[PDB]
């Protein structure tokens, strides 16, 4: 649903962790007195169906235009012309529909500052922050990394307004497998799946 | 011989680091005292 | 331009809908609600316009098999294949390369 990377900040310690990935929960809360219509799926589905109506109107308009062009063009090579233009119009219609679905189902939140990347990635499938039930921690068994990662996860939940008394269950795979220096995220992704 | 100017400090303080990270609309402003571009609380999580 | 016309029609429809909602809601906190929904509708309109521009100016050829990535990247700016006047070869000075 989401995959992001980040850097921390300015400092003189290369291996020292940081909260840079906390930006994945970045959200604006200056005016949240009322809920976004954009976070409501019925609203997004309404916009999608309106766009679908517009797309089919556009497709029939382009179809009658192509019919007029086929009337104008000589009938000798009409079949090849019609087939080419039908493939073209089909591709255009499908691209437009996919664009509407991208606008209202997948990337409805990429421009919204009051929807964080984390919350929006969940909300594409109707999941709320509370539905993020498990966190595969890096969990290296070092002091700085474990404290920093717990603090980052906690700040993400606090800012995204996760329900109180609903801690994410932290899975630490490296107690068993150990730390590979780059297979680590892949092993944790396997475990998460 | 100062084309490379190393930054001593990040544009946010440690206490405001998380707030800057969590605000997508936070932007640095020129500080009246220091004269450098830094993050400011009145600009972090502000309605303007 | 047809998509722009549709987008402005959609924006005025959503604006009158928001006006009806503002009439329904009590007038005490009307200003904050109106500002939030106006920023929301502006962002939605901007996203839709940008999507149309993506569809027809930038990413018009990503689905077309009769347009190659090279020709499409050129054609986004009106350039034809002939306009690709220079090629920076890797030019490693080996035979095979």
Curated annotation (Swiss-Prot), chain A:
Post-translational modification note: 4'-phosphopantetheine is transferred from CoA to a specific serine of the Acyl carrier domain by the C-terminal PPT domain. This modification is essential for activity because fatty acids are bound in thioester linkage to the sulfhydryl of the prosthetic group.
Positions of modified residues (Phosphoserine): 36
Active site positions: 138 (for beta-ketoacyl synthase activity), 179 (for beta-ketoacyl synthase activity)
Organism superkingdom: Eukaryota
Other comments on record: Present with 17000 molecules/cell in log phase SD medium.
Function of the protein: Fatty acid synthetase catalyzes the formation of long-chain fatty acids from acetyl-CoA, malonyl-CoA and NADPH. The alpha subunit contains domains for: acyl carrier protein, 3-oxoacyl-[acyl-carrier-protein] reductase, and 3-oxoacyl-[acyl-carrier-protein] synthase. This subunit coordinates the binding of the six beta subunits to the enzyme complex.
Family statement drawn from the similarity comment of this UniProt entry: Belongs to the thiolase-like superfamily. Fungal fatty acid synthetase subunit alpha family.
Subunit structure: [Alpha(6)beta(6)] hexamers of two multifunctional subunits (alpha and beta).
Protein name from the UniProt record: Fatty acid synthase subunit alpha
Whole-protein coverage range: 1405 to 1597 of 1887
From Swiss-Prot, chain B:
Recorded name of the encoding gene: FAS2
Purpose of the protein: Fatty acid synthetase catalyzes the formation of long-chain fatty acids from acetyl-CoA, malonyl-CoA and NADPH. The alpha subunit contains domains for: acyl carrier protein, 3-oxoacyl-[acyl-carrier-protein] reductase, and 3-oxoacyl-[acyl-carrier-protein] synthase. This subunit coordinates the binding of the six beta subunits to the enzyme complex.
Species for this entry: Saccharomyces cerevisiae (strain ATCC 204508 / S288c) (Baker's yeast)
Record PTM: 4'-phosphopantetheine is transferred from CoA to a specific serine of the Acyl carrier domain by the C-terminal PPT domain. This modification is essential for activity because fatty acids are bound in thioester linkage to the sulfhydryl of the prosthetic group.
Family: Belongs to the thiolase-like superfamily. Fungal fatty acid synthetase subunit alpha family.
Name of the protein in its database record: Fatty acid synthase subunit alpha
Cysteine pairings via disulfide bonds: none
Complex formation: [Alpha(6)beta(6)] hexamers of two multifunctional subunits (alpha and beta).
Domain of life the protein comes from: Eukaryota
General remark: Present with 17000 molecules/cell in log phase SD medium.
Curated annotation (Swiss-Prot), chain C:
Domain of life, source organism: Eukaryota
Active site per the UniProt annotation: 90 (for beta-ketoacyl synthase activity)
Post-translational changes noted in the entry: 4'-phosphopantetheine is transferred from CoA to a specific serine of the Acyl carrier domain by the C-terminal PPT domain. This modification is essential for activity because fatty acids are bound in thioester linkage to the sulfhydryl of the prosthetic group.
Additional information: Present with 17000 molecules/cell in log phase SD medium.
Family note: Belongs to the thiolase-like superfamily. Fungal fatty acid synthetase subunit alpha family.
Subunit structure and binding partners: [Alpha(6)beta(6)] hexamers of two multifunctional subunits (alpha and beta).
Function: Fatty acid synthetase catalyzes the formation of long-chain fatty acids from acetyl-CoA, malonyl-CoA and NADPH. The alpha subunit contains domains for: acyl carrier protein, 3-oxoacyl-[acyl-carrier-protein] reductase, and 3-oxoacyl-[acyl-carrier-protein] synthase. This subunit coordinates the binding of the six beta subunits to the enzyme complex.
Protein's UniProt name: Fatty acid synthase subunit alpha
Annotated source species: Saccharomyces cerevisiae (strain ATCC 204508 / S288c)
From-to range in the entire protein, with total length: 1453 to 1549 of 1887
